[PDB]
Design a protein around this ligand. Structure first.
Ligand SMILES: CCCCCCCCCCCCCCCCCC(=O)OC[C@H](COP(=O)([O-])OCC(O)COP(=O)([O-])OC[C@@H](COC(=O)CCCCCCCCCCCCCCCCC)OC(=O)CCCCCCCCCCCCCCCCC)OC(=O)CCCCCCCCCCCCCCCCC
Ligand SMILES: CCCCCCCCCCCCCCCCC[C@@H](O)O[C@H](CO[C@H](O)CCCCCCCCCCCCCCC)COP(=O)(O)OCC[N+](C)(C)C
Lengths: 175, 121
């Protein structure tokens, strides 16, 4: 339902075939389904709607917390402990958000693999490439930091990678 | 050594006149409370050594123990604070009077300093 957002967790249009029986023998599945819904689903729906109308009598809201965009570790003097603290907390929050982004893409991939049945190898190419890109980015940013990671170590890793990339680019430009 | 000889110092004063320009320690200072606790412990040990009821034997002498420890501790804390204030005063004055030995270096940001990265793997 609308409990979540369909654009971040997309699903195919859900095509299902119609029953086209070749025999007039009674179908046990349909009769069992009628017994099940009549004897299980109806009481569950009445209980749920009672609970929902009880909830409607007393309704309150909780709000998602918003955070500002404080200066990052690159805009901090070498020993400014307060700017360092702000930047470190912001970096850690961004690290958590990136972790959850990777989690979302992994959930997408798992759902694709389960849904596609026997055609998952071809029908889940877009999800696989999305996970490849996200995991490649996540790996560049945080892999090998180790225990005791910090914004400074991530910055040093990024600077080393940028130096290597610049050296490679200028060497290739000398041909 | 370092503080033994200083200009304008009275030999056996224990509390120079310039120490009165400092805030006195509060009577509820935790160090004073610890001194009172030391006095109470001394009174209890006095009771136990002399084979007397430890908690209740002598209340007047236990009170004297506690107040004596608090009384000495107050002046001890005053002198402690005065000597630390002298240390900071002298250090700041020496820094101010010798600028070339304590120069303010250029402020660099972490975007400019190149720190080597050591991977963990
Ligand atoms: C860090 C946080 C705080 C911790 C600080 C440190 C600990 C506390 C302070 C220590 C000093 C204080 C007391 C020292 C003198 C006491 C000596 C003693 O024997 O006591 C007996 C006495 C009982 O004896 P009694 O009632 O007269 O009659 C029975 C006979 O006397 C019975 O006599 P007896 O002849 O039969 O006794 C024989 C016995 C007697 O031998 C002993 O009792 C041992 C004596 C203790 C040695 C103390 C040395 C100096 C303190 C150093 C502490 C080191 C701490 C660091 C960690 C390392 C641990 C060693 O010897 C043995 O049987 C051999 C046993 C061998 C065991 C070896 C281990 C002993 C050393 C361990 C010391 C650790 C601290 C103990 C503290 C309390 C001990 C009583 O104990 C007490 O009643 C006093 C306890 C404290 C009273 C406080 C109550 C005040 C009011 C309560 C309310 C609080 C506020 C209210 C306001 C709230 C609003 C409502
Ligand atoms: C377990 C702790 C042991 C403590 C030992 C006994 C505790 C009580 C000490 C007795 C207090 C009276 C002593 C002096 C009072 C008045 C005399 C006054 O003139 O003394 C002046 C100043 O008083 C004394 O110098 C300082 C005595 C303070 C003793 C307490 C410090 C204990 C060390 C830290 C442990 C924590 C103890 C906590 C309380 C139990 C001397 O100035 P000065 O002529 O220039 O010094 C010459 C020698 N110098 C320069 C080399 C130092």
């Amino acid at each position: 339902p609308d409990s979540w957002d369909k654009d971040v967790y997309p699903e195919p249009p859900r095509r299902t075939p119609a029953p086209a029986p070749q025999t007039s023998l009674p179908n046990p599945v349909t009769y069992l389904t009628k017994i099940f819904d009549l004897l299980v689903d109806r009481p569950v729906t009445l209980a749920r709607e009672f609970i929902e109308q009880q909830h409607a009598k007393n309704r309150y809201y909780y709000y998602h917390r918003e955070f500002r965009r404080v200066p990052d570790i690159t805009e901090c003097e070498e020993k400014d402990i307060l700017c360092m603290f702000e930047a470190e907390m912001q970096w850690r929050r961004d690290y958590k958000v990136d972790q959850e982004i990777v989690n979302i893409i992994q959930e997408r991939l798992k759902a694709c693999q389960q849904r596609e049945g026997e055609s998952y190898r071809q029908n889940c190419a877009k999800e696989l490439e999305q996970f490849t890109q996200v995991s490649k980015a996540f790996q560049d940013r945080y892999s090998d930091l180790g225990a005791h990671y910090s914004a400074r170590k991530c910055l040093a890793k990024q600077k080393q990678r940028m130096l290597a990339e610049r050296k490679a680019a200028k060497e290739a430009a000398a041909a | 050594t370092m503080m033994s000889g200083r200009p304008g110092r009275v030999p056996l004063q224990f509390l120079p006149n310039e120490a009165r320009s400092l805030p006195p320690p509060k009577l509820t200072d935790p160090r004073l409370v610890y001194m009172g606790f030391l006095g109470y412990c001394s009174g209890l040990i006095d009771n136990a050594i002399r084979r007397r009821p430890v908690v209740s034997a002598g209340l007047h002498r236990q009170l004297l123990y506690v107040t004596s420890f608090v009384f000495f501790g107050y002046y001890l804390l005053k002198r402690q604070d005065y000597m630390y204030a002298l240390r900071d005063h002298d250090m700041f004055a020496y820094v101010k009077s010798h600028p070339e030995d304590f120069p303010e270096k250029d402020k660099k940001t972490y975007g400019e300093i190149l720190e080597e990265f050591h991977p963990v793997r």
